[PDB]
Amino acid sequence: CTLKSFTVEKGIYQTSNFRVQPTDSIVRFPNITNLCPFGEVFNATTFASVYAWNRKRISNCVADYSVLYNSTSFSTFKCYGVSPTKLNDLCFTNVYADSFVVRGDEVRQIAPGQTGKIADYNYKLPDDFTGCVIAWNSNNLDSKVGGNYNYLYRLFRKSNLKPFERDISTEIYQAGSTPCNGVEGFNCYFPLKSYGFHPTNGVGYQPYRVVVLSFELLNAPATVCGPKKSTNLIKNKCVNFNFNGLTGTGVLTESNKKFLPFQQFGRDIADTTDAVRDPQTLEILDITPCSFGGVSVITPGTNASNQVAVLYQDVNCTEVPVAIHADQLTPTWRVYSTGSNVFQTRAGCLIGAEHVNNSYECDIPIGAGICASYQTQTNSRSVASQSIIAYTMSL
Amino acid sequence: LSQGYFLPFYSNISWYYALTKTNGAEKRVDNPILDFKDGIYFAATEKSNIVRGWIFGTTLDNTSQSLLIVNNATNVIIKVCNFQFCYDPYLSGYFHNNKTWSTREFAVYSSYANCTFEYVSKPFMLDISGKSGLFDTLREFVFRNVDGYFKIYSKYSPVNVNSNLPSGFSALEPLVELPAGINITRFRTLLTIHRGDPMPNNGWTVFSAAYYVGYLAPRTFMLKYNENGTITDAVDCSLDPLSEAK
Amino acid sequence: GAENSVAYSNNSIAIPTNFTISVTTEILPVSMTKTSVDCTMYICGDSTECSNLLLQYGSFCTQLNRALTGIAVEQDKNTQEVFAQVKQIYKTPQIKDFGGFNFSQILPDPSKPSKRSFIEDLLFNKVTLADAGFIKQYGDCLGDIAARDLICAQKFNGLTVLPPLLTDEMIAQYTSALLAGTITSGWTFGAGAALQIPFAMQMAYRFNGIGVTQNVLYENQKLIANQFNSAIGKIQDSLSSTASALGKLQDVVNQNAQALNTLVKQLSSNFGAISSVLNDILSRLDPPEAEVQIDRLITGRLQSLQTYVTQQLIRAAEIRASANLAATKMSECVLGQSKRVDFCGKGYHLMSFPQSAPHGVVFLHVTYVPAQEKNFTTAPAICHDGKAHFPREGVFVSNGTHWFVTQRNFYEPQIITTDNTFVSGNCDVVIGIVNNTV
Amino acid sequence: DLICAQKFNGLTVLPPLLTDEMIAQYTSALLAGTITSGWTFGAGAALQIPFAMQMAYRFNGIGVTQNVLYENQKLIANQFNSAIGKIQDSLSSTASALGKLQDVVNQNAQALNTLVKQLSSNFGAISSVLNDILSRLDPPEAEVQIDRLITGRLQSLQTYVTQQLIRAAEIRASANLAATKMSECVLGQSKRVDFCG
Amino acid sequence: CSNLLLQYGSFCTQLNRALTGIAVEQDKNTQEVFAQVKQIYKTPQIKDF
Ligand SMILES: *[C@@H]1O[C@H](CO)[C@@H](O[C@@H]2O[C@H](CO)[C@@H](O)[C@H](O)[C@H]2NC(C)=O)[C@H](O)[C@H]1NC(C)=O
Ligand SMILES: *[C@@H]1O[C@H](CO)[C@@H](O[C@@H]2O[C@H](CO)[C@@H](O)[C@H](O)[C@H]2NC(C)=O)[C@H](O)[C@H]1NC(C)=O
Ligand SMILES: *[C@@H]1O[C@H](CO)[C@@H](O[C@@H]2O[C@H](CO)[C@@H](O)[C@H](O)[C@H]2NC(C)=O)[C@H](O)[C@H]1NC(C)=O
Ligand SMILES: *[C@@H]1O[C@H](CO)[C@@H](O[C@@H]2O[C@H](CO)[C@@H](O)[C@H](O)[C@H]2NC(C)=O)[C@H](O)[C@H]1NC(C)=O
Ligand SMILES: *[C@@H]1O[C@H](CO)[C@@H](O[C@@H]2O[C@H](CO)[C@@H](O)[C@H](O)[C@H]2NC(C)=O)[C@H](O)[C@H]1NC(C)=O
Ligand SMILES: *[C@@H]1O[C@H](CO)[C@@H](O[C@@H]2O[C@H](CO)[C@@H](O)[C@H](O)[C@H]2NC(C)=O)[C@H](O)[C@H]1NC(C)=O
Ligand SMILES: *[C@@H]1O[C@H](CO)[C@@H](O)[C@H](O)[C@H]1NC(C)=O
Ligand SMILES: *[C@@H]1O[C@H](CO)[C@@H](O)[C@H](O)[C@H]1NC(C)=O
Ligand SMILES: *[C@@H]1O[C@H](CO)[C@@H](O)[C@H](O)[C@H]1NC(C)=O
Ligand SMILES: *[C@@H]1O[C@H](CO)[C@@H](O)[C@H](O)[C@H]1NC(C)=O
Ligand SMILES: *[C@@H]1O[C@H](CO)[C@@H](O)[C@H](O)[C@H]1NC(C)=O
Ligand SMILES: *[C@@H]1O[C@H](CO)[C@@H](O)[C@H](O)[C@H]1NC(C)=O
């Protein structure tokens, strides 16, 4: 499968990896299990005005939107930087609500790149928002039979708002070059105007409640987590792990590294997490790749034979079953994990070749001055079999 | 390599004093309305903890949302409100006869109403009692207003120098990020002036302190991290040819 | 450089009256660190869905691994072409009476466990090999506390360093066989079997091969031996202290290590994706939305691997050129005496000694390098009996009123005789001629 | 100009460390040592020898004994002059000095000009004008186009550098050949057939 | 665009390293061809060759 050919010639080949496929999944979300208030956030009697929009901490929580399903249907549930399907497999270190009420035709203005009175004078979502926006029609709630004239919106402003920057002024806006000194008039403008959400208006003029859930995931301890159920911990097998939304595939081991009191995972030189703090036991688990790079296959040729040898590069012959995790391999692989002809070289551990103390010329260069050859043992040891041998190369 | 708003190395930094001259003759209390621009670096050298607050905003009155930081004895109090500040804000440290501090005067603002943000962090006590000697502490802060977030970074260090901002490298750790969505262009420091029984005139007196204001500019910095994630060294690419080669 | 205006001489010559057997040293890379790159382990790591994306993306890495395997096989072939040389493994000639020439620090000693000479010891000490020369086990990388090393990152990211087929000790055995054949046969073992010859007289023949007759050696033999020993000791000390053995070899080793470290550190490049952490992409986006970012990452890391392999092929072209040069110098100065000028030393080549060095070979070129010049007056085709006479292996230089036919590169004046000068042509047709002799 | 565009687009030509006059001084020193010492200055100190004698030894080194040189000496000199005179004239009008050197110079100039012209390639972006991309799209929507342009221009730079590495490999082969020739053809007399003529 | 190139990757250090190697190799080629000797001999005014 590495060479992509049903016929393999005599030699030594660096097979990439096909031994191990993880069969177990590990989830280690912390001890929160407390239903987060989505009736104290989504089911509030009154939200803020878009100019004076509210913002709140969410604190320790399980964020399961499934509880809201028979409460209201979210017409707008666009999510940025995070897919909705993954929202149940994640933990968030910080979450903010950013709730307000707008007109329907203006919900499309709650987006990173948008222009309009809401997106220029009122809210101005940033360009790297990485949270996501929930919006739903609230004409049943935020509408009085005479029209609800709360939810002020800033109509004029001398400059565009900055991302996430609020602005309460109550000043007087100058259209022309005639000072108002703080009094109203004809060229003088009050910068805020009331929506006027009557119940029987067009759907574009009916109120919509928007919750701009801006959440960030850092190396801090997780604060809000999804509904995912925490499983047990497997500490010697190649598994799929998901600790606080940080998924991966590897072997978890006891580690003696020291983390900061608020550090959840370590990092390698590359952008790979090599250690993670299990948030239930608070232990530190080292993460090792499932794939073991260094396995070379020594073949005399498929037309010649099917017996092969395996060189495991830079490993101890005792550690080979643990290095390649021979428990999860098929028995045909487990034949080459342990045995009698487990000759140890400087290049690595050679299993499947009968090491001989004779010095023949090189046939298949193995490494560290050792060569393999497919020799006729039938004429050697009474009635024996054609077999692979390894030896020190002859100079 | 990171492009951002940094305090450029060897920048021109405004030094301000707070000191009483001989026998209470020349009084140095200075709370100028400096410009915030693109965030600031503020360094305080003191023996008695006298630099105890900050004002942030644009118009610095009830016209615009403002920010007050008060690092008084009981706590640190960060209040984003419509603070109608008086003309010459300062804190007045009341000293009790029992060698205790009752530093509650609030000569910083005349009122506050219709406001959004309140914050209190890390219940702790810090003394402002007079200490003989020189400035024993150097406290550094970086103040930013980015993406609706008021960021404060801090570094505290006991140092004994005669004066004038001892030379060295300081990497300021993230202290607190506040969800205050306000516009900030101008700011002024809050010092505390002593009262009680230091001299029977019962006027105003101050202890020796200095504070330093530097301006953040858009530069590129080459930063180095250790395994803890702490910045241990930094290069200002625009400072000089050697730093640009680095 | 220094201005050295030499006075052109219409009739004068400068014959050097005293040489300087100098052991120049050159260092030639012979091989580079051969590496293997795993497709999915680098590009994707342990991910089934990223593996599927890389499968449907294309089959680049079969070609990449074919190129890398070609590079590794060529590295082994270069090492065979230079070090392997003669397969007959000649052992050290216990009889060490080499006419004064010592070879004590160039021929290996059985005292230490490794049959590696002391000059080879200094060479192997000078080159750090801080990346792959040391032995690192999987147990070392599995258990660690402080921080994962660069080599552990490379191993866990699909980057492996394949050990060379020829062990350093058997490389030293090749070099010891070459040295034994050179100090017992000299050059005859480069054509057929080794033909034994006492070192002094094959040394005399090596002078014969630079126009300096054997009349020099047996007359100066102790001086020749002591000069060679002093030169070998001086280069030994300089090698001990000047760190000049780094040269090309340390540059090659650092180049390979830096290329591997660049490949590892370039896994943190976003390439336009949301992040370089593949698991953060895979743990925040649905497979459709995640496919765009993972394809950007696949393209970026495939380009990184392609660049790595491209300058690996270019570097292996340079290494193959240097190894062909090393084989040419091995089979023209260790197996013979090259007549090319400045091919195996500044002066007139005498021989060369191969020394194993990390991923390379060191040549101790022994050269003639004459000195102690002396002005004489020269005139060709002396007119005797009305006929021009020309010097057979002579120059026709003059002392005061005395004309001596003299060897080219060594002032050994001799009287004019017909068995040393050949007559041809009438005299007076030749431009600068004078007899007064023979 | 082309060179102004290359300079303004980050492509600079570093001058060689040796100026042409230092190259001429090296060549003059080599010529002086060759017409006064011949070849002895390639090993140790230059050893003075009249030119009509080192030419006799150069005859001796091709199997033609010195009895040939002086007995034809004058003619030989004139013939060489005639020979040199011919390359004095043909080189003045045949444009043969271009050869592979003009090819190298044109190759490098064309590579740099190609690199400059690749800045007009869209690479799948809306336009190759980075400022028109940056003056028509917000940072998010411009991320995609600028990343496409970055990938394209990075691939152009990578192709330029890879072809420069291959060109420097062949230039290094020719420079090793030139060093071997000047060490053998100029600092001695090569016995290789068809190496120095 | 500089920020985008910064987060995109760090290729240009590699590219400039390759180009600097090329330039140093050009200087070394010139040194190994032309210089090759450390004695500058001036023209032999005596022209009777
Ligand atoms: C933050 O406040 C400052 C000043 O309070 C604003 O700057 C002023 O903007 C108006 C309208 O564009 C101009 O007429 C003034 O000349 C500006 N003054 C200064 C000193 O810049 C600034 O626009 C505000 N920021 C935002 C995002 O609204
Ligand atoms: C430091 O400042 C805080 C903030 O004003 C003071 O705490 C206030 O105390 C009053 C009366 O005790 C209360 O009504 C407020 O609610 C408190 N506010 C907060 C935020 O705590 C505190 O008393 C000051 N400390 C001193 C020593 O004066
Ligand atoms: C703070 O803002 C509120 C909201 O506007 C003010 O309360 C309103 O005051 C006006 C007076 O012009 C009344 O007509 C409204 O009925 C009030 N509304 C509410 C909900 O109280 C309040 O006056 C402001 N604070 C101060 C000190 O002026
Ligand atoms: C990373 O952080 C740890 C913990 O703060 C540092 O270890 C401390 O080092 C100081 C100074 O040697 C000691 O006084 C503490 O007792 C140590 N604490 C622990 C938990 O070990 C460590 O030095 C930091 N890393 C670096 C490079 O400074
Ligand atoms: C030729 O050169 C050699 C080496 O320079 C001379 O031998 C040296 O003689 C001096 C004086 O006795 C000693 O101090 C050196 O140690 C000797 N060196 C060696 C290598 O033995 C030799 O005398 C010279 N011969 C002539 C004729 O000039
Ligand atoms: C060898 O060839 C040369 C030509 O290269 C002959 O010299 C020429 O003689 C003719 C007749 O006198 C002149 O017209 C030419 O100009 C001469 N050329 C040169 C280079 O001098 C020479 O005579 C020939 N000798 C023999 C023996 O054949
Ligand atoms: C919630 O579930 C109950 C039980 O069936 C149902 O009657 C109710 O309508 C649901 N809520 C909504 C908003 O439909
Ligand atoms: C929202 O609040 C109202 C009033 O308290 C209540 O009747 C309703 O059931 C609440 N809905 C949810 C989903 O909690
Ligand atoms: C988490 O909960 C489990 C089960 O109740 C318990 O065994 C464990 O000690 C808890 N850990 C923490 C840190 O609360
Ligand atoms: C493998 O482990 C055994 C057990 O400690 C040890 O004796 C042996 O030396 C190891 N092999 C190595 C390190 O190559
Ligand atoms: C080969 O020789 C070794 C040397 O002791 C011996 O141990 C071994 O049994 C011999 N036979 C083999 C390896 O088949
Ligand atoms: C610092 O700025 C002030 C105000 O412009 C100026 O007067 C002073 O000369 C500056 N100092 C330096 C060292 O640039």
Ligand SMILES: *[C@@H]1O[C@H](CO)[C@@H](O)[C@H](O)[C@H]1NC(C)=O
């Ligand atoms: C040869 O070298 C050895 C060891 O360096 C030394 O003991 C011996 O005296 C040397 N002999 C000669 C002749 O140089």
Ligand SMILES: *[C@@H]1O[C@H](CO)[C@@H](O)[C@H](O)[C@H]1NC(C)=O
């Ligand atoms: C040879 O002559 C030159 C020119 O006068 C002089 O510089 C040099 O010293 C002389 N050398 C000897 C050995 O006489």
Ligand SMILES: *[C@@H]1O[C@H](CO)[C@@H](O)[C@H](O)[C@H]1NC(C)=O
């Ligand atoms: C040597 O040359 C001189 C000058 O021409 C001449 O007189 C003399 O006869 C020549 N001697 C011989 C042996 O030819």
Ligand SMILES: *[C@@H]1O[C@H](CO)[C@@H](O)[C@H](O)[C@H]1NC(C)=O
């Ligand atoms: C060499 O020349 C010197 C000085 O002219 C003289 O004293 C000596 O006798 C001459 N010897 C020979 C062999 O010509």
Ligand SMILES: *[C@@H]1O[C@H](CO)[C@@H](O)[C@H](O)[C@H]1NC(C)=O
């Ligand atoms: C140069 O040498 C030639 C041959 O001896 C002679 O004919 C000529 O006159 C000499 N010229 C001078 C003055 O050096």
